[PDB]
Amino acid sequence: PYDVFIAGSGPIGATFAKLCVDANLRVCMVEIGAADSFTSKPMKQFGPGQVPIPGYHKKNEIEYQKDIDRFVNVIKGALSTCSIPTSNNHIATLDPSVVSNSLDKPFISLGKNPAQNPFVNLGAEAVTRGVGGMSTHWTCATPEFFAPADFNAPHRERPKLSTDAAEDARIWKDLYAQAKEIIGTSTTEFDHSIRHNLVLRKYNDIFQKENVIREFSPLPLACHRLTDPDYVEWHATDRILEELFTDPVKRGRFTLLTNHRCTKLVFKHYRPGEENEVDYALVEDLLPSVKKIYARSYVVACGAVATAQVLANSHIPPERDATIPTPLMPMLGKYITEQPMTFCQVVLDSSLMEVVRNPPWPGLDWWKEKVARHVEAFPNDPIPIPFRDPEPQVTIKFTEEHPWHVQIHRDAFSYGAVAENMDTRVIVDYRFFGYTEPQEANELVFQQHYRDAYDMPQPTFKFTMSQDDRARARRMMDDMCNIALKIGGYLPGSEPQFMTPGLALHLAGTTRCGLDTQKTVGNTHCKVHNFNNLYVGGNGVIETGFAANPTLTSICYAIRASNDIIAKFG
Amino acid sequence: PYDVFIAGSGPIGATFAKLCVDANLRVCMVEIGAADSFTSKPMKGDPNAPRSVQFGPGQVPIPGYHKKNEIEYQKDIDRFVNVIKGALSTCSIPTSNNHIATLDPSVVSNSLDKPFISLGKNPAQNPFVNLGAEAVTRGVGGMSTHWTCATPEFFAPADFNAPHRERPKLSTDAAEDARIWKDLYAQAKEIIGTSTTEFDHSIRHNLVLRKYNDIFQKENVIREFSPLPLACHRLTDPDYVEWHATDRILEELFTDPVKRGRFTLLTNHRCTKLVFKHYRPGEENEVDYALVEDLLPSVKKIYARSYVVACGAVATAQVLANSHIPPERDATIPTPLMPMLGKYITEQPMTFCQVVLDSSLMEVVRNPPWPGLDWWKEKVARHVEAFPNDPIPIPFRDPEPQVTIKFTEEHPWHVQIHRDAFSYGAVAENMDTRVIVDYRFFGYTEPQEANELVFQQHYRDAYDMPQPTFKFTMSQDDRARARRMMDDMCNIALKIGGYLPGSEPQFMTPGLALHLAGTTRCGLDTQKTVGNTHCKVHNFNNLYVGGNGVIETGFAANPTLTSICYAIRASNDIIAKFG
Amino acid sequence: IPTSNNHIATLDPSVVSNSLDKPFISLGKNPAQNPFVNLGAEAVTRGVGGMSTHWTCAT
Amino acid sequence: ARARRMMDDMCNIALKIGGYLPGSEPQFMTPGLALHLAGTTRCGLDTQKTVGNTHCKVH
Numbered sequence A: 001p002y003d004v005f006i007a008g009s010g011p012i013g014a015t016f017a018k019l020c021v022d023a024n025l026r027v028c029m030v031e032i033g034a035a036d037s038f039t040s041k042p043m044k045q046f047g048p049g050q051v052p053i054p055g056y057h058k059k060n061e062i063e064y065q066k067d068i069d070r071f072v073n074v075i076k077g078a079l080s081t082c083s084i085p086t087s088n089n090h091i092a093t094l095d096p097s098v099v100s101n102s103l104d105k106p107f108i109s110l111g112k113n114p115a116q117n118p119f120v121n122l123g124a125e126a127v128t129r130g131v132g133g134m135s136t137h138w139t140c141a142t143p144e145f146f147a148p149a150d151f152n153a154p155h156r157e158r159p160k161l162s163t164d165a166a167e168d169a170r171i172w173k174d175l176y177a178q179a180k181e182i183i184g185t186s187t188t189e190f191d192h193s194i195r196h197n198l199v200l201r202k203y204n205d206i207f208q209k210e211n212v213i214r215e216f217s218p219l220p221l222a223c224h225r226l227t228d229p230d231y232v233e234w235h236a237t238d239r240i241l242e243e244l245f246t247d248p249v250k251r252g253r254f255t256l257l258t259n260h261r262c263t264k265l266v267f268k269h270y271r272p273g274e275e276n277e278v279d280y281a282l283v284e285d286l287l288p289s290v291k292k293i294y295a296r297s298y299v300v301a302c303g304a305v306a307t308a309q310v311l312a313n314s315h316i317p318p319e320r321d322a323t324i325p326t327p328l329m330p331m332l333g334k335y336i337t338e339q340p341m342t343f344c345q346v347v348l349d350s351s352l353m354e355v356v357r358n359p360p361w362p363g364l365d366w367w368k369e370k371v372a373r374h375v376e377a378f379p380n381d382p383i384p385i386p387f388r389d390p391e392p393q394v395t396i397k398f399t400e401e402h403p404w405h406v407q408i409h410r411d412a413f414s415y416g417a418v419a420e421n422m423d424t425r426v427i428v429d430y431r432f433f434g435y436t437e438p439q440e441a442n443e444l445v446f447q448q449h450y451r452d453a454y455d456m457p458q459p460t461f462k463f464t465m466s467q468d469d470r471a472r473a474r475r476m477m478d479d480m481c482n483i484a485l486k487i488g489g490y491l492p493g494s495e496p497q498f499m500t501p502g503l504a505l506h507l508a509g510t511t512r513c514g515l516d517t518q519k520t521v522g523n524t525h526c527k528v529h530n531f532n533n534l535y536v537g538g539n540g541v542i543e544t545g546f547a548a549n550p551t552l553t554s555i556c557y558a559i560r561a562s563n564d565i566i567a568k569f570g
Numbered sequence B: 001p002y003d004v005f006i007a008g009s010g011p012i013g014a015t016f017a018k019l020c021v022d023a024n025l026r027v028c029m030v031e032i033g034a035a036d037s038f039t040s041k042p043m044k045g046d047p048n049a050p051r052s053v054q055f056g057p058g059q060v061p062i063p064g065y066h067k068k069n070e071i072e073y074q075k076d077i078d079r080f081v082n083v084i085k086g087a088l089s090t091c092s093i094p095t096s097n098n099h100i101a102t103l104d105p106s107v108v109s110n111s112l113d114k115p116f117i118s119l120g121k122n123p124a125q126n127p128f129v130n131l132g133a134e135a136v137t138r139g140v141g142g143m144s145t146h147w148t149c150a151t152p153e154f155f156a157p158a159d160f161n162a163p164h165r166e167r168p169k170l171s172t173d174a175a176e177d178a179r180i181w182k183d184l185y186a187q188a189k190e191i192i193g194t195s196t197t198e199f200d201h202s203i204r205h206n207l208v209l210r211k212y213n214d215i216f217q218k219e220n221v222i223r224e225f226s227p228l229p230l231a232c233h234r235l236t237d238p239d240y241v242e243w244h245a246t247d248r249i250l251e252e253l254f255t256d257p258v259k260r261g262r263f264t265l266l267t268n269h270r271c272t273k274l275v276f277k278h279y280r281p282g283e284e285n286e287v288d289y290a291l292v293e294d295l296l297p298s299v300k301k302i303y304a305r306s307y308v309v310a311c312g313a314v315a316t317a318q319v320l321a322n323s324h325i326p327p328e329r330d331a332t333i334p335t336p337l338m339p340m341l342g343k344y345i346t347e348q349p350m351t352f353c354q355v356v357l358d359s360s361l362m363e364v365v366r367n368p369p370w371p372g373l374d375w376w377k378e379k380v381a382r383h384v385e386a387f388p389n390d391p392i393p394i395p396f397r398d399p400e401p402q403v404t405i406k407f408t409e410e411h412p413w414h415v416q417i418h419r420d421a422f423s424y425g426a427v428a429e430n431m432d433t434r435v436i437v438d439y440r441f442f443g444y445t446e447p448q449e450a451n452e453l454v455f456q457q458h459y460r461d462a463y464d465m466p467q468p469t470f471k472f473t474m475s476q477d478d479r480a481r482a483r484r485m486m487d488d489m490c491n492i493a494l495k496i497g498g499y500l501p502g503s504e505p506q507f508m509t510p511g512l513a514l515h516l517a518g519t520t521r522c523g524l525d526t527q528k529t530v531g532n533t534h535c536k537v538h539n540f541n542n543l544y545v546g547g548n549g550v551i552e553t554g555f556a557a558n559p560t561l562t563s564i565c566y567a568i569r570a571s572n573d574i575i576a577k578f579g
Numbered sequence C: 001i002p003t004s005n006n007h008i009a010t011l012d013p014s015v016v017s018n019s020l021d022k023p024f025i026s027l028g029k030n031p032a033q034n035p036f037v038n039l040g041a042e043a044v045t046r047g048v049g050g051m052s053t054h055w056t057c058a059t
Numbered sequence D: 001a002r003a004r005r006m007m008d009d010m011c012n013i014a015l016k017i018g019g020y021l022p023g024s025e026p027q028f029m030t031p032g033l034a035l036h037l038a039g040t041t042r043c044g045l046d047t048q049k050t051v052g053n054t055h056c057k058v059h
């Protein structure tokens, strides 16, 4: 038997694999999707003594470094919508002899969820299936979560790991330091971008003179600029898995089964509230069947929706709208949280081009030389910013006084048609993410009689944000308009707007882990209550309402859980 | 050093690689793009192989795999349109200076006399003579990693001196030409893995094929409907298909250690230009070396006994144009060493529509009239039992139709009646996908000298190669055929269904077929060709071309299979001369 | 209303078309108007009452 | 400069009582849409810079 079985090969599952292998444990990881993105590294380019490493970021391919607007297509092709409501719309202009729906015989459409109420849905919530999970397309933003000065403040982003405030703080500090190294967070990789510096420095100058000061800083990113500074390597699961492929000793302790579905775990017994154990994982090989995989410990790291889906499916030992009850894990799927998001784009003020030509800040000879050079080579370009200058990567850290997360940047995930007519150097994006309070009645439940395309129980969302959440969302939209208009004016088609619920993909709380046993699925080590050898990972473990991007904080938890596993099962 | 240098790793370059390595020659292939789509196969002779798991020890990754083979896309095929749009880089986009009236008046703006300057728009391009949807894919396997896999033969008329033919002449003797093509086509179908039977137990395919033959067998002009030949095979789990791509061609160059030893594939390596022994027109000449650039974080000379440019129809001409510069702002690169380079280009006008199947055909699905269709009745019975309330009795996941009408000179176009991963508008949110059927009719254009691809001296693409510009105007005869084709499509479509809102009969943008041909055209008439019928470039003993750019005729059918035939023919010349 | 000469890529190839050098002549467009210095939505109403037969009546 | 201030004021004021209706988010309209074109026959005290006097008699 393996020492550790892991379902899922995203960055969290990879963290478990890496840490467990480094501690001399034998690990078997199942991934339901395909290894579809690779780099290569030499053994301790895809020819001789080099080894192929999957879970590489798709954006690292030179074609997307050159024509970055093409990458929206990658992301749209990677995302599979979780819950799509049925509908029965009349199509008036059909040819009258063709197949048609009617009031009494609607179409029955493969893939839709008849149980979903569209008014309580997270309609843009989605999943990516493949080695690396969502990390093969993500934006790589890795902020820390906010912790208030007072450990008993009414709200915090950063969960509590201890009732002892000073220990909690020291533990998080080092965890965040470790998770930064695992994923390779940096704040300096745009420090020689004109656009980045223009936006950062102008905003700080403006907000120093405003009646309420706001601090702008570089968005921390999991990436590194390459020796040819036109290119950036964005980090993904390949960085975490690397030595499991390139070190022959580690490679010998790691098995990765791709196109394998973890269908469910089978338990010693099905009695709620008594000590229990996983007996085996039931796994199906999806290519052209069923395997029991035995290990001493089991980790479900399938992302926020699918981790709960696996655990719900496991309640079934081996009215049409009935859901699977989950009394062995009563808090499964409860208290779920997602982030409201507002968006707009602006075109920079024409007066800022004078700033580009004559910047007032010291230490900027590098910028002066890039502008002078471009100006001399393209005297008729109305924009003096060099052609390939990187986009801005600016944030304002969450505070309780302005309790949302701000990104002022350019993202590969566009939301409508490129502006054919505007030059891309002068466009800036704003995404502002809010938080939702965890509430028991906000839920992810799984259908007994409808299944997804991979024959797993269909997820259904029952999400309604609170009055306080709505009041903050109004303030956030007001903040975005005010901030955006300081440096530019709205680009047509990207005026200030809310996006579809779920579109942030930051769903959390579906397998919530914390100190309060009766309201969580697992403890602070992510061990599921009453199971001696079952652990969860991913954003689903995060029990607080937060606004910042969660993956770094999720990796902290993966570290913790791996060390518990090592402690117990090494 | 190397016996053969190959620029390009699409299915044509791969064909040269496979055949040459099979003949014990040492091959170096450069590919400007990345290996980005893989499968894994056991490595022959590796102690791990018998028990191995995909992408484990001792399997080897094989690039150029079809992206549509991921189960994600076999289950959600409408998502694949995004893969296709992600893979296509448009060749020539005209500049424009449109006024945006609703900009905030404080922001950066274009003006009449100070337009924005965009990298990679082409100021030299006249939009009215463009192939504005012509595009390329840079990656291992080229476009074969997303293609639709249709592999028909080209039409050869009964009379060898008929005015028009799809299939080019390889000999002046009619009988030798026919024998040559018969052997090449057999070999090309085995290389790519063509089959006509992979949809034979789809209700939708069978419905569409049988109905149309029943209708047109009765009409006073008979039209014959047949399965579209497809480079694919259905898997032992019939819910999946393995679509074929360059991985099938290269497989043994990665799984066989003896072959792997003779093959080197350098990815993110641009062939910038070939450098010639000399630069005098009309004189015997040869390639000295290939100038290659590693584009990853440099400039290297690669020597071989023979050189193959298989970079697709546009890029092959681009590499050869740029090789004219040894080591008025709208001036193009003259190409006097290869005077027919980029002349006589052809492309396929295309009409498109979709229909919804007639309600009356659902009764045919429940009670097919044709004898011996027990398999169909069984599938339908299973579905109606599981989903008695479903108005559509076709089973979920029944495969799409895959039907064609072979080109004939009486109706001189290529028909596909199918469902294609390349959707052109928004998916139909309200209509069930089981009852939708697509129609793509492709015409041909006559080769004319004045139709050309040229390359800009002062403008470059994103990979620092000379910018392509098209000067393309179809002929009067090409236009009259296009109208007849549109008319035929409307007539044929409406026999089994009605147009789906949003996909009513329409022409598509010039270039969308991506069947550009004739840019390095090869044939018997030396004076009007870039290469001979072995695709050896005139006046160079050691330079060959491949791809759809070699095809010298006006054709309507999908060209890949015929391009493979030329690759075999050319490889054999290489092997006989240099191996 | 400024003149324009935009290419329509998807016309049926047998139909009447503009070209680079032979644009349509569209009566009532203004060849002298620079679009970037226009008041493009400026308009008149001809009829008894002029604009007062549709205006919002804010005074 | 005044138009940017005005856009900001509009966003601030609108959000005090409601939220933007999809499709009618804050935007500038095409110049001339107000139909409040003026000064084409300007009347005033300064004879050298007007068309008419303060009684609108043409000079």
Ligand SMILES: *Cc1cc2c(cc1C)Nc1c([nH]c(=O)[nH]c1=O)N2C[C@H](O)[C@H](O)[C@H](O)COP(=O)(O)OP(=O)(O)OC[C@H]1O[C@@H](n2cnc3c(N)ncnc32)[C@H](O)[C@@H]1O
Residues within 6 Å of the ligand: A007, A008, A009, A010, A011, A012, A013, A030, A031, A032, A033, A075, A128, A129, A130, A131, A132, A133, A134, A135, A137, A138, A139, A140, A141, A142, A260, A261, A262, A263, A301, A302, A303, A304, A306, A307, A310, A413, A505, A537, A538, A539, A549, A550, A551, A552, A554
């Ligand atoms: C798509 C996306 C995602 C993110 C960004 C932008 C875009 C468009 N931006 C972003 C994000 N997060 C950040 O913190 N900062 C950024 O700037 N994105 C989200 C981020 O990508 C996720 O938070 C992260 O991957 C979460 O990692 P994880 O917990 O490992 O989960 P994944 O979803 O990545 O991978 C899970 C994995 O398990 C597989 N699976 C699912 N079900 C099964 C079963 N039954 N058996 C076996 N395997 C299963 C999935 O296929 C998947 O690979």
Ligand SMILES: *Cc1cc2c(cc1C)Nc1c([nH]c(=O)[nH]c1=O)N2C[C@H](O)[C@H](O)[C@H](O)COP(=O)(O)OP(=O)(O)OC[C@H]1O[C@@H](n2cnc3c(N)ncnc32)[C@H](O)[C@@H]1O
Residues within 6 Å of the ligand: B007, B008, B009, B010, B011, B012, B013, B030, B031, B032, B033, B084, B137, B138, B139, B140, B141, B142, B143, B144, B146, B147, B148, B149, B150, B151, B269, B270, B271, B272, B310, B311, B312, B313, B315, B316, B319, B422, B514, B546, B547, B548, B558, B559, B560, B561, B563
């Ligand atoms: C995209 C597309 C393509 C086709 C269909 C559908 C779609 C959406 N469907 C289809 C086609 N063909 C048919 O016969 N039947 C169908 O059902 N499609 C076209 C087909 O895909 C092409 O005909 C075929 O690949 C051509 O093969 P090729 O001649 O080998 O050319 P490629 O373009 O595939 O690959 C060339 C290759 O060379 C590289 N390159 C370009 N420039 C350079 C330089 N300078 N140095 C090195 N390498 C270079 C490319 O990047 C590319 O990989």
Ligand SMILES: *Cc1cc2c(cc1C)Nc1c([nH]c(=O)[nH]c1=O)N2C[C@H](O)[C@H](O)[C@H](O)COP(=O)(O)OP(=O)(O)OC[C@H]1O[C@@H](n2cnc3c(N)ncnc32)[C@H](O)[C@@H]1O
Residues within 6 Å of the ligand: C045, C046, C047, C048, C049, C050, C051, C052, C054, C055, C056, C057, C058, C059, D035
């Ligand atoms: C169309 C409209 C206009 C107004 C608002 C809403 C809408 C959509 N709302 C509005 C406006 N004005 C306000 O102060 N507040 C409101 O809430 N609108 C504009 C207002 O409607 C005009 O300012 C007003 O009519 C102007 O009055 P006018 O100076 O009398 O000019 P008109 O354009 O109304 O009438 C001129 C008139 O003369 C005719 N004409 C033009 N050329 C000739 C020649 N050569 N020969 C003879 N007659 C001529 C016209 O045809 C017209 O009827």
Ligand SMILES: OC[C@H]1O[C@@H](O)[C@H](O)[C@@H](F)[C@@H]1O
Residues within 6 Å of the ligand: A139, A140, A141, A407, A411, A413, A431, A503, A504, A505, A506, A549
């Ligand atoms: O929609 C794109 C956004 O998606 C979110 O998942 C990311 O965390 C942001 F960084 C990103 O801007």
Ligand SMILES: OC[C@H]1O[C@@H](O)[C@H](O)[C@@H](F)[C@@H]1O
Residues within 6 Å of the ligand: B148, B149, B150, B416, B420, B422, B440, B512, B513, B514, B515, B558
């Ligand atoms: O545009 C998609 C079409 O493009 C062409 O490249 C293919 O040959 C067709 F089979 C396909 O239907």
Ligand SMILES: OC[C@H]1O[C@@H](O)[C@H](O)[C@@H](F)[C@@H]1O
Residues within 6 Å of the ligand: C056, C058, D033, D034, D035, D036
């Ligand atoms: O566009 C309608 C607007 O146009 C103007 O002509 C009027 O003065 C405004 F009151 C009215 O709301």
Ligand SMILES: [Mn+2]
Residues within 6 Å of the ligand: A338, A339, A340, A436, A465, A501, A502
């Ligand atoms: Mn929400």
Ligand SMILES: [Mn+2]
Residues within 6 Å of the ligand: A171, A560, A563
């Ligand atoms: Mn710890």
Ligand SMILES: [Mn+2]
Residues within 6 Å of the ligand: A525, A560, A563, A564
């Ligand atoms: Mn611990």
Ligand SMILES: [Mn+2]
Residues within 6 Å of the ligand: B347, B348, B349, B445, B474, B510, B511
């Ligand atoms: Mn054409």
